[PDB]
Amino acid sequence: ASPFRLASAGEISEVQGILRTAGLLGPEKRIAYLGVLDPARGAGSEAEDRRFRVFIHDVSGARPQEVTVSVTNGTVISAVELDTAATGELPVLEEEFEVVEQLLATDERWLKALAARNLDVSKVRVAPLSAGVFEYAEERGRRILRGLAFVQDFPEDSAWAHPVDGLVAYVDVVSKEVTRVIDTGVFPVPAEHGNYTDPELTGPLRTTQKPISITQPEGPSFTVTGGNHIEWEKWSLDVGFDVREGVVLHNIAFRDGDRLRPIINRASIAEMVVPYGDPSPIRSWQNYFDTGEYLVGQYANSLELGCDCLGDITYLSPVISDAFGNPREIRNGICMHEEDWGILAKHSDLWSGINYTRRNRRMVISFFTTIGNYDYGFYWYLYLDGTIEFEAKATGVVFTSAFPEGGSDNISQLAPGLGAPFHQHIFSARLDMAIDGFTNRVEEEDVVRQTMGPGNERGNAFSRKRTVLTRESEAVREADARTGRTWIISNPESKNRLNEPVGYKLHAHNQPTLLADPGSSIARRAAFATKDLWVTRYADDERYPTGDFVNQHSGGAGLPSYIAQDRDIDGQDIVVWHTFGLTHFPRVEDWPIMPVDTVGFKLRPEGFFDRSPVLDVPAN
Amino acid sequence: ASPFRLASAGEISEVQGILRTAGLLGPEKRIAYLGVLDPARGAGSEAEDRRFRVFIHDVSGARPQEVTVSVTNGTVISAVELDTAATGELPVLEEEFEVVEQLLATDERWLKALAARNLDVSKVRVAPLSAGVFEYAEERGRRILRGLAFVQDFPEDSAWAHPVDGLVAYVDVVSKEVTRVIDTGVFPVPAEHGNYTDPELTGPLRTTQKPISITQPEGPSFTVTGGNHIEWEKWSLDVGFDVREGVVLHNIAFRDGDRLRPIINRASIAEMVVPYGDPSPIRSWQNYFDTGEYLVGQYANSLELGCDCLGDITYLSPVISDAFGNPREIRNGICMHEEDWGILAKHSDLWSGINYTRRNRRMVISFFTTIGNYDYGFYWYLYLDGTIEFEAKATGVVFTSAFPEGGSDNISQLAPGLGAPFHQHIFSARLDMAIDGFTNRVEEEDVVRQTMGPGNERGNAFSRKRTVLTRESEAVREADARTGRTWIISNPESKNRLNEPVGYKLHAHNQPTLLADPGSSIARRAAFATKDLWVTRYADDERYPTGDFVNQHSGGAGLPSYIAQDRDIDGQDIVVWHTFGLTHFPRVEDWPIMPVDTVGFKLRPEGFFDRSPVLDVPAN
Ligand SMILES: [Cu+2]
């Protein structure tokens, strides 16, 4: 039955066949995005209609199309020609990555710049970087990538050690033309290598680490059915995968006694942006929407056993479309395992003589992706006690530049002559809430300090206040760590045994949000990133906080356009969008390859249950 | 040799013998505190002088003494009579716990109160609670405990389910007198039981949890020598234990190449307070300094294998003094183990063809203690990449009251008629810094936003600023999560290869600090808790942010008195005191026994190293 099952190779081939049959997938066409659509609200009562949405690019320069296909019925539901100057360019194609370097290698301006620096063109790698929207009027309606150069001394060398600063180029990847080459002047190209497998740099490897072995002799405590339905320690969910978003969780519910209680209908990372804070013209245009522009799912790594995922691992191998509509498996792209998580509850009571200890566990669902120099791990955790958590793990190699003589307010030094521009990694979690069903609301909860006086003569009292967010116009919220600000999603028609609305409380890390000036291009294109929390009324076409087409797309779509509708959110089907990020001032310890740093958020039950939900956990 | 070794049973017996011989430990004397003193600055060049400090109480009502003993030389160094009205009462004695209930059981006012509620005196437990300092002039100079009552239906019942609100009593535990019994009126005593081992409440226990087995077939990668010296993955430290503070880490250093580089000289939790925010006269005096008043070390649990600590565990069994000066072992009171900690670093490089993944690990040093209804786990972690972290795990049973008819702004409902007053758990970490040696300083680092304009035409730039804290008068700092505020401890005379001062950056969680009105008794007695970060000049007698004697002690000592000295801290031997806590509005899920909640902080290297320190970690 399962309407939330992963796409199969056969479904993708059939989408390809349907498109071909319909005249939409001739030899000049390329698939820039393909994904299964979630079933509509209700209609789980009806027979399956598996629908797939496709963005089709044309390499001969004709307008791209957005297409919805019913794979069940073998039909095209809708196909519309896109005006990209207005609505955005399609996501970057994997086949365009190589094009920037290739076009530049025969360009006389680029060659003159390399020759001024005594760099062999055969050794110069060019990063294929998203262009954004700035002052270049000729780029409007064209697919442009910008290129920054890095020297590779030999095939196995880490090019990131040798940035070529002072030089940037812009390229039209469809007409195969170089539009501009800007050379503001030579900077020394940093000379030390960054080869973290070279024994001259590592020194002799440690022989001190004795093995750790994590096994489950009876296997894992979770089950997988219908390909992607998980049942684990009262939790129930479906693990989805989308080429843009990566791992998506559907139908997160908890079995409380006999009743399956919904909590979250859909949880995803719906956008992630990496804005750079170096004002040099060489990099001041740099903002990488890894999700919206590049598609993080498509670059998911195949995860090796004992290296990437440790313990008794169950893998999913999601299927995506290549550029021609053929299915491609990402072997072992999603890890699922349970792990010990320390003490769950402990008490040694003097009066009763009873000593009690129980252990915690969490279910882990993860993938790891690679976008250029960056590598990100996306982890979802379900805990025994009802807690839901997300964590991103950032690693890879830092994006480099020259380190200016005389220093910089916007770049860190990593090695002689080698710099790392300041930047942020900012995520948007889209949480289509379903706390005991879809009739939900959100309150902002602050701690309330109280003045010494009548009613409070000793000046010890403190309290809290909750403010219901009633309509979308008042549901754009900032953090306030000093007052312990959180947000509670509740169901006003579902009460616990103490007659209080059931709820879950979101605990944020209260890290800085987008730092750019509010008048900047990035502040408009990544508007979501300027505030910690947004609440909208659910609509099927409001999927990403940046809109459907982010590449070279101005403001006009996404969250600011959604909330303008000012819809009722007080006891309605609502979606929480939480912004959270890392602000990175690179340190010498990040070089030549960076140790993982993390960021995330969690939600804990708040009167959802009638008492602790883990009283039935056994000892030892 | 080891001058930081744990106290042995023999040393404690010898302290007892020295005190006896000197006329200081006759039959009326009781030891309220005993601990080894750290060796003085320098003088590691000289022969050992193991000194022990003792607080001696007199049950016949004579003044207590503070005593310093050289166990090496068999001498009393100093002995001074204490005026407790001025300097504070000695910590609560374990033998006083039972006294409050015992005295009250034959008091006619208490009996009249129990009879008004139809409660059998034989079933009424009385919590022995610290008294603090309020308006009762007769308590000044006397050792007072206050008592709140909880009914125990039968020997194995959890009394916390049945609070007797409306009733409090005060008791002089030396003269064995009841000074006051206050009955403001009857409240219903909540009737449901809170017995989390009763199958009627748990239901049938889960049979779904398959085993997890964590083993190390070649044993752990750390070594223990001289009883308590740890060497693990370039780290070196000594694990101390003190009856007040619990586990204390000494001499945290990292072996970078051939050179042993100090980082932290002493790390401890030097205080922890639990202030309550219910303005009722029954509880408005309630603030439990678990460290300062009760001594968390002395109530350390014996930790069972496979239950409390999982994996290949090495235990320490610290020795403390009983009330008469006899040694008592806390069997298996400290756990030490290493554990896997996910991915350390990962990169899959397109240009080089090299795919690289390494795993992280941490060394864990922990203990768990029980103070009445609360149980706390204290965990220190050392990571491969140089990160140092502390985490507290709070669990146990919530402290209860009646839930008022018509509700409360300062109490949560847990069950019919059962309330849980709001409260905080606030810790002070004392970090006697030694970043590459003792010449250290502290800077406050904020993110700096930048205006779009000349130099920043695209409005993308952002930066940071560092402010040196030069003297103690300017080193009392608050959090600012919005600006990403951290604090960097550096050594201005020790530079990395890039000519920047080596340092470590403290990352706080930016949770709310003490909420009480600044004019309250708790705001003065727990002044440390009102600000996130303090920096002092090291002095051997500045051990606790609350002073040596916290019990029934007003303001006058501790951190506000230390910083008044306004000493130079810019490139000197300094101590960082970080306040961090949990603000707890109890939820129904906390009842009848609470799932662990956590709080903590970490410090990460910040130009301490010349490049990543984990390039020599091997694969797989
Ligand atoms: Cu970064």
Ligand SMILES: [Cu+2]
């Ligand atoms: Cu609490």
Ligand code: NA
């Ligand atoms: Na919803």
Ligand code: NA
């Ligand atoms: Na110091």
